[PDB]
Structures are given as C-alpha cells and as structure tokens.
Amino acid sequence: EEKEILWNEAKAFIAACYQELGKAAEVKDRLADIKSEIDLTGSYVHTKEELEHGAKMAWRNSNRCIGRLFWNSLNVIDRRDVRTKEEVRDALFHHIETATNNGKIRPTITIFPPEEKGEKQVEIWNHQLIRYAGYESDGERIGDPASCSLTAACEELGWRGERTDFDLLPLIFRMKGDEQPVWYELPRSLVIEVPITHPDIEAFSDLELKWYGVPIISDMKLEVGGIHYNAAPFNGWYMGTEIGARNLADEKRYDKLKKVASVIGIAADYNTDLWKDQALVELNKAVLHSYKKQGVSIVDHHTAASQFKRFEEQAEEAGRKLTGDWTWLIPPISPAATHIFHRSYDNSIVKPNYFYQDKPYE
Amino acid sequence: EEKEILWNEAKAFIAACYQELGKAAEVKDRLADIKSEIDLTGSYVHTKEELEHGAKMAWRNSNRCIGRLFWNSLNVIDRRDVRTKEEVRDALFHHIETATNNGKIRPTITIFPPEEKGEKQVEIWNHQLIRYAGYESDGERIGDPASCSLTAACEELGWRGERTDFDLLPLIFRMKGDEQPVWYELPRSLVIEVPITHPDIEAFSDLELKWYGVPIISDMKLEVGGIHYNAAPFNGWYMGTEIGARNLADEKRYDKLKKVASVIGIAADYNTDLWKDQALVELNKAVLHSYKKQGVSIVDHHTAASQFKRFEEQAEEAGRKLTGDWTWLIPPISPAATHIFHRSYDNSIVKPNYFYQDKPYE
Numbered sequence: 042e043e044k045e046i047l048w049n050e051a052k053a054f055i056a057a058c059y060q061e062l063g064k065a066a067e068v069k070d071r072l073a074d075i076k077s078e079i080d081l082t083g084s085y086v087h088t089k090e091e092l093e094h095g096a097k098m099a100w101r102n103s104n105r106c107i108g109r110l111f112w113n114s115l116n117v118i119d120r121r122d123v124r125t126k127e128e129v130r131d132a133l134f135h136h137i138e139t140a141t142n143n144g145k146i147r148p149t150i151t152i153f154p155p156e157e158k159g160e161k162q163v164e165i166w167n168h169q170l171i172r173y174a175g176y177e178s179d180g181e182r183i184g185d186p187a188s189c190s191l192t193a194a195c196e197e198l199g200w201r202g203e204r205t206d207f208d209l210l211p212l213i214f215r216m217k218g219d220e221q222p223v224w225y226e227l228p229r230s231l232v233i234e235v236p237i238t239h240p241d242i243e244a245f246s247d248l249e250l251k252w253y254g255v256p257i258i259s260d261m262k263l264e265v266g267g268i269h270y271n272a273a274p275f276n277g278w279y280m281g282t283e284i285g286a287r288n289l290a291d292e293k294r295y296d297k298l299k300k301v302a303s304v305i306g307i308a309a310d311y312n313t314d315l316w317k318d319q320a321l322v323e324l325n326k327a328v329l330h331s332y333k334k335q336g337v338s339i340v341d342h343h344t345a346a347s348q349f350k351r352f353e354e355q356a357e358e359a360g361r362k363l364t365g366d367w368t369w370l371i372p373p374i375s376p377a378a379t380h381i382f383h384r385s386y387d388n389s390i391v392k393p394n395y396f397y398q399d400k401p402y403e
Numbered sequence: 404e405e406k407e408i409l410w411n412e413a414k415a416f417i418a419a420c421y422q423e424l425g426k427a428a429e430v431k432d433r434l435a436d437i438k439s440e441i442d443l444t445g446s447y448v449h450t451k452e453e454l455e456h457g458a459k460m461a462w463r464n465s466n467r468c469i470g471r472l473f474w475n476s477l478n479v480i481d482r483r484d485v486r487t488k489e490e491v492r493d494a495l496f497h498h499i500e501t502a503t504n505n506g507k508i509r510p511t512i513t514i515f516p517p518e519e520k521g522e523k524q525v526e527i528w529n530h531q532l533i534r535y536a537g538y539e540s541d542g543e544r545i546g547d548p549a550s551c552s553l554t555a556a557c558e559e560l561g562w563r564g565e566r567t568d569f570d571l572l573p574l575i576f577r578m579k580g581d582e583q584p585v586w587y588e589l590p591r592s593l594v595i596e597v598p599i600t601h602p603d604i605e606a607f608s609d610l611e612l613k614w615y616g617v618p619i620i621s622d623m624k625l626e627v628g629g630i631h632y633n634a635a636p637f638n639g640w641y642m643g644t645e646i647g648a649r650n651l652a653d654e655k656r657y658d659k660l661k662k663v664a665s666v667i668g669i670a671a672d673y674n675t676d677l678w679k680d681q682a683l684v685e686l687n688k689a690v691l692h693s694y695k696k697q698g699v700s701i702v703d704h705h706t707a708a709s710q711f712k713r714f715e716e717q718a719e720e721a722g723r724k725l726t727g728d729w730t731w732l733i734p735p736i737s738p739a740a741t742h743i744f745h746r747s748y749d750n751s752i753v754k755p756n757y758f759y760q761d762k763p764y765e
C-alpha cells in the first residue's frame with residue numbers, strides 16, 4: 042500500500058501543479074508515465090519544473106510562516122545528482138554563499154536525492170547549516186543551550202569546540218551506507234555575522250552580542266507528490282523578533298534580558314516596572330539597527346505582518362484557501378499591534394509541505 | 404427533552420459539587436428531591452451552597468481567564484429574590500460598591516433569578532456595569548467605539564450623553580413583562596476612576612487619559628447544573644495590559660499610541676524603530692503606576708502568569724484536569740516572557756461555566 046499512497050499523492054500534486062502552471066492538458070499523459078514508472082521502479086522522478094514549483098507550493102502551505110508573500114520567488118537548487126560526501130559538502134557551502142549573497146539574502150532551497158524506500162541517501166544532522174555550539178558541564182553553561190546535544194554528538198566524532206559563546210558548529214551529515222556521519226568546519230569567509238549595537242545607547246556594545254546572518258533550516262523534510270526529500274535545507278532572512286525575543290532573550294537560550302536591563306540603565310527588580318518588556322523592546326530595536334547598518338537583510342514584525350496581510354489578499358484573489366497557525370504567526374513582541382492577532386486561521390495541513398522528522402542522534 | 408437535558412446536567416453537577424464539598428453521602432437523596440421537583444415544576448432550585456460553589460466552579464473552568472488561582476475566594480451574592488426594577492438597580496449599585504471596596508477590589512458575582520423556560524426574568528443590556536459611551540457621526544468619533552451601538556440604543560430611550568470621551572453609560576436592563584428596558588444614571592460617588600500618569604515622564608498627563616477601576620462583566624450567562632443564570636454580573640481586578648494594550652491602545656478603541664509616542668518624545672515614522680512597541684511598554688508602565696499610586700487593585704502580566712502557574716500546579720495536585728485557551732491566556736505584551744507561551748492547553752469546555760449570549764439590541 043506504499044505504492045498506492047504514492048500514486049494517490051502523485052495524482053493530486055500533478056493535477057494541482059500543472060493547473061497552476063497552465064499545463065492542465067498534459068496532466069493526462071504525465072500521470073500515465075508516472076503510473077508505469079511506479080509499477081516498474083516503485084517510485085517516480087520529478088521534472089525540474091515539478092520540483093521547483095513543488096518546493097514553492099510547500100512554502101506557500103507552511104501554516105506557521107509569516108513570510109509567505111514571497112513564496113513564488115524561492116530560488117530552487119536541484120542537487121538530486123549528488124553521490125559523494127564531497128559533493129554534499131560543496132553543495133552546502135554553495136547554498137550558504139548564494140543564499141547569503143553578500144548580505145542581500147536570497148530565499149533558497151537546495152534539494153538532495155529523496156528517500157528511496159524510507160531509506161535516506163543523505164542524512165543531515167544540523168538543525169541549521171549555520172548555528173552556534175552549546176556546552177553544559179559542572180554547572181558551567183557556554184554558548185547556545187539549544188545546541189547542547191548536537192554539540193556533544195559532534196565531539197564524539199573527533200571535533201572539538203573552542204568553547205566561546207559563539208563557536209560555529211561544523212556541517213555534519215551521513216551518507217547511505219556509512220555507519221558514521223562526517224563533519225566539516227565552516228569556512229569563516231562564508232559566514233556573515235552581525236555585532237549587536239544600539240542606535241542611541243553606546244554601552245550596549247559592552248554585552249558583546251552578535252548573531253549569524255542567515256537562518257538555514259536543514260532538519261525538515263520536503264514532501265512533494267508523495268516523494269520524501271528528507272534532505273532539503275532552506276533559508277529566508279530573519280524577522281527581528283526571532284533574534285531579539287527568542288534566540289538572545291529566552292531563558293533557555295542566551296538569556297540576556299537582565300544584562301540588557303543593566304546596560305540600558307533600568308532596574309530589574311520589580312515585575313510592575315515592566316523591565317523585561319522594556320529590555321525586550323530595546324534589544325529588538327538594537328537587532329534591527331545592527332542588521333540594517335551592516336547591510337544584511339532583516340524584517341521587523343510590523344512590516345512582516347503587513348506583507349502577510351497581502352499574502353492573505355493574494356490567496357483570496359487567486360481562489361486559494363488560506364491556512365495558518367495563529368500561535369506561530371503572531372509575533373512575540375506586541376502581537377496585538379498586528380492584524381494577525383485579531384483574526385483566526387484554519388490550521389489544516391495542505392501538501393506539498395515541510396515536515397518535522399526524527400533526529401538521527403540523541 | 405428540555406427536562407432530560409436539565410436532569411442530566413443536574414446529576415453531573417450535584418455529584419461533582421457535593422464530592423468537592425465532602426457531601427457525597429447526600430448526593431443520593433438530593434438528586435431524588437431534584438427529580439421530583441423537575442417532574443413537578445419543570446425545573447429545580449439550587450441551595451445557597453450549590454449556587455455559591457457552582458459560580459466558583461464556573462470561574463475555575465473559564466478557559467480564557469489567567470486569574471483563576473483565586474477561584475475559591477469569589478464573593479457570591481444571591482439575589483434570586485429580586486422582583487422589581489428598583490431592587491435590580493439597587494443590587495447593581497450594591498455590587499459596584501462592595502466589589503470596589505474603596506479600591507481594594509473584591510472579586511464578586513451577583514446572581515439574579517434564572518431563565519424559567521428560556522424566558523429571562525431580568526435582561527441586562529450593558530456589557531459591563533461601568534463603561535464609557537461611544538459616538539460616531541459625520542466622521543466625528545468620541546469616546547469608546549466599542550460602546551457605539553449600546554450608546555445609540557440608550558439614546559433611543561430618552562438618555563443623552565454629554566459627549567466627552569469618558570461619559571459613563573447608565574445601567575440599562577429590562578424586566579420580564581416590560582416591552583422596554585429602563586435606564587438609571589450611575590451615582591458618580593460609586594465609580595472610582597484612575598487618571599493615567601507616568602512615573603518618570605511628566606508630559607504623560609497632557610494626554611488626559613483615565614480609566615475606571617473595576618471591570619464588571621454583565622452580559623454573560625452563568626450555567627450551573629442545567630440552570631441558566633443569564634443575569635449574573637461578575638468582576639475581578641484588571642490585568643494592566645487590558646487597559647494599556649487593548650482599551651487605550653487598540654485602533655478600534657481609544658487608539659492612543661501615536662499620542663503616547665509623541666509625549667514620550669519618540670518619532671512615530673518607521674516600523675523598524677519599533678515605536679509602537681516602545682509606546683505600548685510606556686503606556687503599560689503608566690497604567691500600573693497610576694492604579695498603584697491611587698490604591699486601586701491591579702496586576703501586571705508577569706505576576707498574573709506566575710499566579711496562573713500556581714493554578715496549574717494546584718489543579719494537578721487536586722487531580723483535576725486543567726483546561727485553557729492559549730490564545731487568550733498569553734498576554735498581549737511580551738507573551739514569550741511568560742511560561743504560558745511555552746506550553747499548550749486543552750481548550751475543552753467543562754461546566755459549570757460562563758457563556759456568551761445574544762445581545763437584546765442591535
């Protein structure tokens with residue numbers, strides 16, 4: 042019944058895809074070719090056109106994403122041809138370079154060979170292609186706590202981190218047939234980072250905060266027409282709150298709010314002073330200012346919500362149902378100042394889409 | 404089948420209520436009495452003990468309420484004895500006085516006679532017992548836009564507002580048998596208001612903002628054991644964000660953020676400046692400071708969330724399932740700084756509870 046699931050997904054995808062591409066007349070013959078191919082080989086192979094539009098539809102269907110207005114301009118890189126670790130490594134390096142684009146970030150996805158029969162051809166261990174290591178031992182915490190398990194796994198493979206608060210994790214991935222993943226250090230010339238300063242508060246630089254330019258999610262599966270692309274890293278540019286209200290502020294992440302309060306010169310003693318809220322706003326102002334000053338793409342949550350409003354309007358105008366997850370779409374700073382907060386969204390799952398998958402380590 | 408719905412709700416309520424009250428042995432005889440009474444009269448009458456605990460359970464089951472830690476100290480006033488408009492009016496005046504308690508607010512509910520056969524005995528028109536009128540005509544907007552329809556209805560009944568931004572609406576309610584509601588002006592001596600000032604920014608008083616002390620919801624139905632108390636106004640004290648991030652900030656309410664930005668001396672020109680977020684924090688700081696300075700009860704969203712965490716713990720320790728609506732429980736200012744944001748809640752409906760009902764006017 043594996044094949045029947047595949048055939049059914051394929052039928053729905055090809056019909057929808059070709060309809061959007063004005064290719065509806067070709068659906069008939071294409072599906073026949075696909076049915077023979079499944080009968081024969083147990084699977085089928087997407088055309089470049091199908092793969093590209095599939096990855097775009099998958100972004101368009103991502104309920105939790107506020108950035109979807111730009112779904113149709115996704116840059117899709119087809120790497121279904123890779124067979125070696127060196128090719129995978131080089132393709133990941135290339136993704137970083139071309140997505141970064143000297144700071145003018147290009148939303149990009151690199152697509153590797155798909156699962157054959159649930160059997161991965163390439164298995165990426167990183168959560169993002171660029172991320173900081175984390176350490177916790179003898180009560181001492183260093184770096185990003187979110188990376189502790191992956192960092193420990195890396196250090197089992199012969200890697201060693203410098204134990205700064207911002208060590209770049211190496212790329213780590215496993216090839217079909219290999220028992221152990223390989224790891225490769227990131228060339229620093231490929232990785233843009235932004236030091237965090239504040240537009241008005243000179244002392245903010247005393248915190249010595251920085252973040253990386255481009256979030257490149259590398260642990261999710263792209264599913265298109267029943268084909269499972271478990272290895273298909275993708276990136277956008279950041280919304281500022283992701284850095285300033287989550288990565289740097291969260292108590293289980295960099296946990297910087299008390300330090301922020303101190304450098305902006307407010308007490309951190311009384312809940313009624315709303316010092317956490319004030320620190321959050323100033324940290325978030327600093328993040329946006331810093332990315333802008335450096336010429337690295339970023340969007341603030343107000344502008345992002347306005348773009349998302351246009352996405353909603355575009356969907357209605359195209360006759361497409363809109364799906365969304367309110368709990369993820371609202372920004373974590375002043376959510377009620379956005380239109381998103383004041384409406385509801387159908388959280389139904391539509392494919393093609395991106396999905397969570399089990400981690401290959403613990 | 405009306406009766407069967409009633410009997411079934413009654414059975415579940417009485418069993419649960421008496422169990423919590425350590426009265427489980429009396430459930431048997433009480434249910435027999437109730438069954439006879441329903442057979443006879445089509446309904447049944449709660450004991451004072453049942454009514455009081457029922458209203459408390461209803462608060463405890465209110466999924467959208469962050470204030471539930473204090474459910475068991477609700478002050479329940481039994482006014483099932485009222486028969487005249489003067490008695491209803493006087494009971495509403497009394498509720499305001501005793502709930503206000505010179506600023507040390509007491510969570511209180513006044514319970515009027517229940518619906519007989521869907522037939523209301525008392526029909527309250529106000530959304531809250533204390534609220535400001537709103538006007539919109541010839542492009543001119545005055546007061547609270549949320550009150551526009553009710554205000555227009557009042558002005559059909561012979562009332563006239565002064566058309567300040569803070570006119571107190573009169574009490575308005577209808578008795579069974581009467582075609583028209585009556586209205587009564589609130590004695591100003593009963594109504595505490597708080598002028599909004601900022602702890603550090605002297606100019607904030609130039610905005611001439613104020614709000615009323617006590618939110619007394621008067622348009623919801625209390626349902627206990629199948630009995631429908633459509634008229635049962637209840638109050639708590641405010642959480643500061645309700646005033647500073649909703650009532651005064653919302654574009655469809657008092658819409659004060661641009662004016663706040665001006666008095667705190669920041670530009671309101673660029674989304675990336677996060678001026679709306681900064682204005683929201685300062686307005687919210689001002690609200691808490693002002694209520695505290697005046698000696699009127701209020702809670703900030705951090706303290707409220709910590710209290711709610713204790714409510715969760717208390718529920719687990721008592722063996723009670725917890726229900727909640729994440730979308731209402733998170734505060735609209737720095738939600739991710741509260742524990743609520745980082746967990747999920749079962750939004751199932753448990754009775755006794757408070758419910759929306761159709762408005763008696765348009």
Ligand code: HEM
Nearest residue numbers: 100103105106107108148275276277278279280369370395
């Ligand atoms: C172009 C700039 C982009 C911005 C500003 C953006 C913004 C965001 C934000 C802020 C979130 C997380 C919301 C939260 O934590 O509550 C998110 C989630 C997501 N975005 Fe986007 N995004 C962008 C591009 C992309 C692209 C190119 C894709 C894929 C092709 C994508 C797919 C997703 C997915 C799948 C999630 C959910 C991840 C999960 O469930 O863990 N986004 N986006």
Ligand code: HEM
Nearest residue numbers: 462465467468469470510637638639640641642731732757
């Ligand atoms: C003691 C102080 C109290 C505080 C601070 C408090 C806090 C709140 C807040 C902030 C909300 C709205 C959340 C939002 O808009 O997202 C709310 C909703 C609610 N509260 Fe409470 N509350 C308190 C007391 C009470 C009492 C005494 C009752 C009833 C006996 C009650 C029942 C409710 C109900 C029914 C709602 C939802 C209203 C609706 O659906 O429109 N609360 N509470």
Ligand SMILES: Cc1cc(N)nc(CCc2cc(N)cc(CCc3cc(C)cc(N)n3)c2)c1
Nearest residue numbers: 256257258275276277278279280283368369745
């Ligand atoms: C492609 C892309 C671009 C872009 N700018 N941002 C993303 C999302 C990045 C992201 C990364 C992590 N580690 C966690 C979350 C959600 C954290 C989270 C967790 C839970 C549980 C709830 C919630 N609201 N948010 C989101 C993807």
Ligand SMILES: Cc1cc(N)nc(CCc2cc(N)cc(CCc3cc(C)cc(N)n3)c2)c1
Nearest residue numbers: 383618619620637638639640641642645730731
């Ligand atoms: C007894 C009691 C005490 C206390 N402190 N606060 C309340 C709630 C008062 C309240 C009043 C109004 N008008 C609207 C909302 C919800 C506004 C709202 C609407 C929607 C649609 C979503 C959302 N999250 N919030 C809440 C009751």
Ligand SMILES: [Cl-]
Nearest residue numbers: 256283284288
């Ligand atoms: Cl991130």
Ligand SMILES: [Cl-]
Nearest residue numbers: 618645646650
């Ligand atoms: Cl209110």
